[PDB]
Amino acid sequence: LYPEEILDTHWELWKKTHRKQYNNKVDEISRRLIWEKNLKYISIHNLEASLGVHTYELAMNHLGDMTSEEVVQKMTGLKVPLNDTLYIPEWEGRAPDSVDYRKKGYVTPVKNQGQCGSCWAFSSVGALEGQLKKKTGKLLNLSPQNLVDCVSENDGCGGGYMTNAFQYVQKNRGIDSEDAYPYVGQEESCMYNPTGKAAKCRGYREIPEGNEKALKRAVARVGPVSVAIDASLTSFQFYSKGVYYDESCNSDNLNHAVLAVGYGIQKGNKHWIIKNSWGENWGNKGYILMARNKNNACGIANLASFPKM
Amino acid sequence: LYPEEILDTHWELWKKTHRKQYNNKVDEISRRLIWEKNLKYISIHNLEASLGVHTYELAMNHLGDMTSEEVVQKMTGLKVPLSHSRSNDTLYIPEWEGRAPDSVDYRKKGYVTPVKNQGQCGSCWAFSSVGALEGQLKKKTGKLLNLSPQNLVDCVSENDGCGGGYMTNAFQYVQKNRGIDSEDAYPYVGQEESCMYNPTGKAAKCRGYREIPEGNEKALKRAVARVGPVSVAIDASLTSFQFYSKGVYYDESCNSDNLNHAVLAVGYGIQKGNKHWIIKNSWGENWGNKGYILMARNKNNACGIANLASFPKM
């Protein structure tokens, strides 16, 4: 096809705004055509939204010139795996109608992986940081690169699971801090340095498969929990605000690792407050509210786990 | 030209959602083409917004199938005089003393009435006047009543009814009439009729009016802070305004000298670093943010916001 002459000035602005560069002008045109196709999806989606069709709206972000598949390919990293770990929570303790660890100082700044399937690393690091604060009272930026370069059971930027990350930290008797082992985004030879140790782990616990109720209690009593979801949809790729819910979200197509930092209600829609790894320039300042209690949307309660420390 | 076959299902949904009906198929097509042209404006505007170009976003509303001009034609009603007054009358608020609140929102203080809808009648002046009066009725008697704009439409002879008018004349009328009916005593019908002001249903009176210094936002702020809701005139001829959804409205194309709408300033504050006036519109709550719109405050008198401000003295 041909680019829409109207959006010329816009494409240039978008490229500038996101440090987007293209090797060949051919390469560029091809991208420009994807960006434009997406813009249409976004614009028409928002129309349906105003017509009461969706509980959320979309927006053009830094993933504008990428197809959903490319995003799932280059920007996820969850590898589904194949007794003493369960945590079927009891009912009595606490069941606050709403919880938001961002306010309690348990959550660290939204970070950005990008071009490396290290989401598992970030989710693990996310849960650990929540516990570090809950225990020591200090909120530190732990090192995901440490996990990427050292969790041998995981394929580094090729992907992996959170459990293995937890187990590693335990058997390694420690995990570095972001400062002691900065995220470079690429796979490297393990360089875990004892000096920069900043947290430890004494096991892990898994939330009953597909049990949102159990997951709620878990988030309420333990704190932030690592969860896996299906992020293969364009609606998710361009989420801007609102309660995310898409019937096309396959519960069995888990491919992303995010951090559940709380839950609540918004305009009559129950939801989980999720923290993503694609920088704060995506979603609502880095976060996304996902439909809670809606038949386990996107497999939200399928691979939940949190470190025991 | 020519409706993109994609939006077919959508156009039908939109029409349903807004009880939109058309006589001819021809008439309908013509409208469908306007709706689509607007949708594009909206969608591309929001793109620029995400790119940091606008401090606000747009959305498809019930005015979707209307051009800006039609909206300004059938849905405003502010009509500047060309030669205002038959002399003066001490009309001019002279500021105050002390420091002023950084934020004020009369909606919370129970001074504001439900967002109403004029539509297809240039009675905005009526609504703005009634808006300010209601603010004072409460401030004085402690009661919040729905006053009658239809009363103003049908009786303010100096104004052209649904053909338009100014707020001042509305105030003066109520004074010389020694009263104004309540919405219940004189329901807004939307059409011009023979005056039927009934004394029995009187609900408020007015003892004059005061005008805020032309183009003085500082003075206007104090006014809103000390007196309460103030009647103001703005330039509502832009599509960005026609489809405002949320955020601080600010458009460089807003002509300070093209005042054509009468709204009610019910407060002010800051939002995400942008100072703003909280404005109340007359196009129902199905427009703007539940009927309201935040307009850029202290930004070189945006849209002439401080050009024709006034409030009743009662």
**Per-residue tokens: A19:** 């440090």
Residues in chain A within 8 Å Cβ distance of B44: 6-7, 10
**Structural domain for A211, as ranges:** 1-309
Beta-carbon contacts of B173 under 8 Å, excluding residues fewer than 6 positions away, are B152, B155, B156, B157, B158
Of residues B139, B140, B134, B143, the one with CA closest to residue B174: B134
Phi/psi for A272 (5° steps) reads -100, 135
Beta strands in A73-229 (DSSP E): 99-100, 175-176, 197-199, 204-206, 225-229
Residue of A nearest to B286 (CA): A50
**Per-residue tokens: A202:** 């004494």
The total of other beta-carbon atoms located within 10 Å of residue B205's CB is 17
Whole-number Å distance between alpha carbons of B249 and B57: 8
Of residues A89, A78, A84, A83, the one with CA closest to residue A164: A78
CA atoms within 13 A on the CB side of B253: 7
Note whether A120 and A155 are within 8 A (CB): no
DSSP letter string, A167-223: HHHHHHT-EEBGGGS---SS-------GGGEEE----EEE--TT-HHHHHHHHHHT-
* DSSP helix/strand/coil, B279: strand
Residues in chain A within 8 Å Cβ distance of B13: 48, 51, 53
* DSSP helix/strand/coil, B80: coil
Note whether B21 and B33 are within 8 A (CB): no
What torsion, rounded to 10 degrees, do the Cα atoms A242, A244, A246, A252 define?
180
In angstroms, the separation between the Cα of residue A51 and the nearest Cα of chain B is: 7
DSSP letter string, B105-137: ETTTTT--PPP-B--SS--HHHHHHHHHHHHHH
**Per-residue tokens: B21:** 């009906």
Whole-number Å distance between alpha carbons of B220 and B271: 19
Whole-number Å distance between alpha carbons of A76 and A278: 9
**Per-residue tokens: A126:** 């996310």
* DSSP helix/strand/coil, A54: coil
Taking the mean position of all CA atoms in its chain, how far away is CA A160? Answer: 14
Cross-chain CB nearest to A59 (options B6, B10, B50): B50
At residue A157's C-alpha, the angle toward residues A152 and A160, to 5°, is 55
Question: In whole angstroms, how far apart are CA B207 and each of B133, B171, B175, B266?
Answer: 11, 9, 6, 21
The total of other beta-carbon atoms located within 10 Å of residue A64's CB is 24
Furthest CA-CA distance within chain B: 63
Note whether B248 and B294 are within 8 A (CB): yes
Whole-number Å distance between alpha carbons of A133 and A265: 26
Whole-number Å distance between alpha carbons of A8 and B47: 13
Question: In whole angstroms, how far apart are CA B119 and each of A61, B23, B111, B189?
Answer: 38, 19, 24, 11
Disruptive mutation site among B17, B42, B48, B51 for chain A (greatest number of A CBs within 10 Å): B51
Report the structure determination method: X-ray
Residue type, A45: H
What does this entry list as its resolution, in Å?
3.2
Q: For chain B, how many structural domains are there in total?
A: 1
Q: Is B162 annotated in the active site?
A: no
| DSSP one-letter code for A142 | B
Catalytic residue among B45, B54, B261, B276: B261
Whole-number Å distance between alpha carbons of B310 and B209: 7
Q: Which residues pair with A78 in a beta bridge?
A: A160
| DSSP one-letter code for B108 | T
Query: What letters, b where the CB count within 10 A reaches 16 and e where it falls short, cover B173-195?
Result: bbbebebbbbbebbebeeebeeb
Whole-number Å distance between alpha carbons of B197 and B200: 9
What's A80's domain CATH number? 3.90.70.10
Whole-number Å distance between alpha carbons of A133 and A224: 11
**If residue A291 lies in a helix (H) or strand (E), which one and from where to where?**
strand A287-291
Whole-number Å distance between alpha carbons of A232 and A226: 18
**Per-residue tokens: B23:** 């006589």
Cross-chain CB nearest to B47 (options A10, A47, A52): A10
Structure-token match 């489809």, residue found: B243
Phi/psi for B228 (5° steps) reads 125, -155
**Per-residue tokens: A259:** 């951090």
Residues in chain B within 8 Å Cβ distance of A13: 48, 51, 53
Taking the mean position of all CA atoms in its chain, how far away is CA A288? Answer: 9
Beta-carbon contacts of A34 under 8 Å, excluding residues fewer than 6 positions away, are A64, A65, A66, A67
Whole-number Å distance between alpha carbons of B67 and B158: 29
Beta strands in A74-224 (DSSP E): 99-100, 175-176, 197-199, 204-206
* Ramachandran sector of residue B231 (left: φ over 0; alpha: ψ -120 to 50; beta: rest): beta
Residues in chain B within 8 Å Cβ distance of A50: 59-61
Q: Is B9 on the interface with A (CB under 8 A)?
A: no
CA atoms within 13 A on the CB side of A265: 5
Q: Is A48 on the interface with B (CB under 8 A)?
A: yes
